[PDB]
């Protein structure tokens, strides 16, 4: 245990100031090193805090899953409740760890930096300034006139040496005491936070390990199998859908054109129902479909289907309108007219007129 | 398992577009929610990484403690080597955890966001644009002139309906397939990262717990007692120093003035050695001290003491110089002169002259 001699302070030898210099070099080296350690440990504390926050947020989000108003379980919902429980338990372990790290690791290393190293620098400056004042006082004293006596000036210059030497002595001794005390504090401040950190880790691993049992392992293995099941169902569904799409592309290719090959797609004149898009008149396109003796209609941005025409005992005929092709008009058993409706081809045109006639004459 | 009917795509009913709208609302809600979960889990991964880094840095700093060139152990040094070992083991646990979190939690949730949700938005746009093109094509077709036949224009306008309806159909079906596939992926992407995270935690707690044994507890209890010992030694040393300082303040108060009470502090004329600061001449203050028949000297910024005068068989006398008080000059047994030296009081002046004379005449 290195120690500065307080007994040597009054004499204030260069050799004494030399010994001081070595305690000051050490104090600077110690400060440099303990600062790097403070910064590393501060990063551990901050990260553990962030971990506690993010883990708790994860759990909370898993709990809110139900409370979200979803358009499209008993198994999923409960599965997520089980995950949210274990994650929230783990979240508590981090929260307990973070607070113990703040108390048992950060507090003592902060105190070393903010109290003890601060005191060294303060005492060092008070001393430097006392030393400077004394140097000045003894210089002025040394220059007193031997030949012309002036009692008052001589007193004042002598008294300034008294006060400055007294101040220098007291400040040097207190600075020596702090530097000597620092030999002990350097050791406490190194070991105490490490011990705090390690005891906290022992508590953390014990606490987390008690929440992580064979029962959890069972639950996890079960979820692993569920995930494999979903993947298998998905992959099978993909296969079914890819085949459905390839079939539909083949079947639909000849039907994309408004006017299909009339030898392959004859006009159906015996339908009892039809549905499809038509233009109506100043012209909007909407979806028409027959239902229970009614022609109903629905636009793309609409919730349900409105009414267009009653088609019990109605008449329907081809119409000429605004130089357009494939127009027709219904007149119900009221004598009242529908909008002028437009089909997309001769066959579509004929199909609508025939279907409406079919429906109109079967209510009997 | 909710599913859109691919069979309904060609007809493209408002009621079909209505069902699509509900799958799209769900996909948006799902994206929103999974994004929040991605962000929370990303914060866990980042924090665990930072923890791994800061813990490893802590250990490394503890190892470098010796390799720092310190002005002022076997116990401390080895104590720090034991801490650095356990902390580096813990550092490895975090490093193992971080990499498994990246692989088993982050990768699958990233893929959901970057592959699967991206595909939904891409397919949705391709479809919207196909739908818009078809709307335009059927509008132009609907406007063909019934009266003036022009085969080429009629062909081109009809063919644009073919191509746009074909494109709309294919794009709608592929978009339906992805949305249907998404019902399965939503479940995988929720459960797979949770399972990855939990299995990683089980490995971590097991791994960390195997490094934290009864033997470590023994080591920690021993360090706790050492710290208590250092505190006790420190507190006792503080008490000793405070008393030394109070004694020195009492003893030194009458000695701070250059000229002490001459009835209480007689001039010592029988010294065989003296040491103290003197001015020398254009005047510098330095520390003089007698050693082995030599007067030696040392400035504040100096490593060792240089030579001023040999004081075997020398003469010394009071001198008048530059109107200064308390000046004297040595002349050795060579006949050569020292600098003009200045003392700080009559008593200091007399004490130096007497001591030098004492030393000069005892070599005999």
UniProtKB/Swiss-Prot annotation, chains A, B:
GO terms for molecular function: beta-tubulin binding; identical protein binding; phosphatidylinositol binding; phosphatidylserine binding; protein homodimerization activity; protein kinase B binding; protein-containing complex binding. It is found in: Early endosome membrane; Nucleus; Cytoplasm; Endosome. GO terms for biological process: adiponectin-activated signaling pathway; cellular response to hepatocyte growth factor stimulus; insulin receptor signaling pathway; maintenance of synapse structure; negative regulation of Fc-gamma receptor signaling pathway involved in phagocytosis; positive regulation of cytokine production involved in inflammatory response; positive regulation of D-glucose import; positive regulation of macropinocytosis. Residues 209-253 form a coiled coil. GO terms for cellular component: actin cytoskeleton; cytoplasm; cytoplasmic vesicle; cytosol; early endosome; early endosome membrane; early phagosome; endosome. It comes from the Eukaryota. The keyword Transit peptide does not apply. Residues 271-361 form the PH domain. It is a peripheral membrane protein. Residues 2-262 form the BAR domain. Its main location: membrane. Keywords: Cell cycle, Cell projection, Coiled coil, Cytoplasm, Cytoplasmic vesicle, Diabetes mellitus, Disease variant, Endosome, Membrane, Nucleus, Phosphoprotein. Overexpression of an N-terminal domain (residues 1-319) or a C-terminal region (residues 273-709) has a proapoptotic effect. The F&H motif, an approximately 12-13 amino-acid sequence centered around Phe and His residues, is essential for binding to OCRL and INPP5B. Multifunctional adapter protein that binds to various membrane receptors, nuclear factors and signaling proteins to regulate many processes, such as cell proliferation, immune response, endosomal trafficking and cell metabolism. Regulates signaling pathway leading to cell proliferation through interaction with RAB5A and subunits of the NuRD/MeCP1 complex. Functions as a positive regulator of innate immune response via activation of AKT1 signaling pathway by forming a complex with APPL1 and PIK3R1. Inhibits Fc-gamma receptor-mediated phagocytosis through PI3K/Akt signaling in macrophages. It is linked to Maturity-onset diabetes of the young 14: A form of diabetes that is characterized by an autosomal dominant mode of inheritance, onset in childhood or early adulthood (usually before 25 years of age), a primary defect in insulin secretion and frequent insulin-independence at the beginning of the disease. This is DCC-interacting protein 13-alpha. It comes from Homo sapiens (Human). The chain holds residues 5 to 378 of 709 of the full protein.
């Amino acid at each position: 245990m290195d120690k500065l001699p307080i007994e040597e302070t009054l004499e204030d030898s260069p050799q004494t100031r030399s010994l001081l210099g070595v305690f000051e070099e050490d104090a600077t080296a110690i400060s440099n090193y303990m600062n790097q350690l403070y910064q590393a440990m501060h990063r551990i504390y901050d990260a553990q805090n962030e971990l506690s926050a993010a883990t708790h947020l994860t759990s909370k989000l898993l709990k809110e899953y139900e409370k979200q108003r979803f358009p499209l379980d008993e198994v999923m919902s409960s599965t997520l409740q089980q995950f949210s429980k274990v994650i929230d338990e783990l979240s508590s372990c981090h929260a307990v760890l973070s607070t113990q790290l703040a108390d048992a690791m950060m507090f003592p290393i902060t105190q070393f930096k903010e109290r003890d190293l601060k005191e060294i620098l303060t005492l060092k400056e008070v001393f430097q300034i006392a030393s400077n004042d004394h140097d000045a006082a003894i210089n002025r004293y040394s220059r007193l006139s031997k030949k012309r006596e002036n009692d008052k000036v001589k007193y004042e210059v002598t008294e300034d040496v008294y006060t400055s030497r007294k101040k220098q002595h007291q400040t040097m001794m207190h600075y020596f005491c702090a530097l000597n005390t620092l030999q002990y504090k350097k050791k406490i401040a190194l070991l105490e936070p490490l011990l705090g950190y390690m005891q906290a880790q022992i508590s953390f691993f014990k606490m987390g390990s008690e929440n992580l049992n064979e029962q959890l392992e069972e639950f996890l293995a079960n979820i692993g199998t569920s995930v494999q099941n979903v993947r298998r169902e998905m992959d099978s569904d993909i296969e079914t859908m890819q085949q459905t799409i390839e079939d539909l592309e083949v079947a639909s290719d000849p039907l994309y054109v408004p006017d299909p090959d009339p030898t392959k797609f004859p006009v159906n004149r015996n339908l009892t129902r039809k549905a499809g898009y038509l233009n109506a008149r100043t012209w909007d396109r909407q979806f028409y479909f027959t239902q229970g003796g009614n022609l109903m209609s629905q636009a793309r941005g609409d919730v349900a289907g409105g009414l267009a025409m009653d088609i019990d005992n109605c008449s329907v005929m081809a119409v000429d309108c605004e130089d357009r092709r494939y127009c027709f008009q219904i007149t119900s058993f009221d004598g009242k007219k529908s909008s002028i409706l437009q089909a997309e081809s001769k066959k579509d045109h004929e199909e609508w007129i025939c279907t409406i006639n079919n429906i109109s004459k079967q209510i009997y």
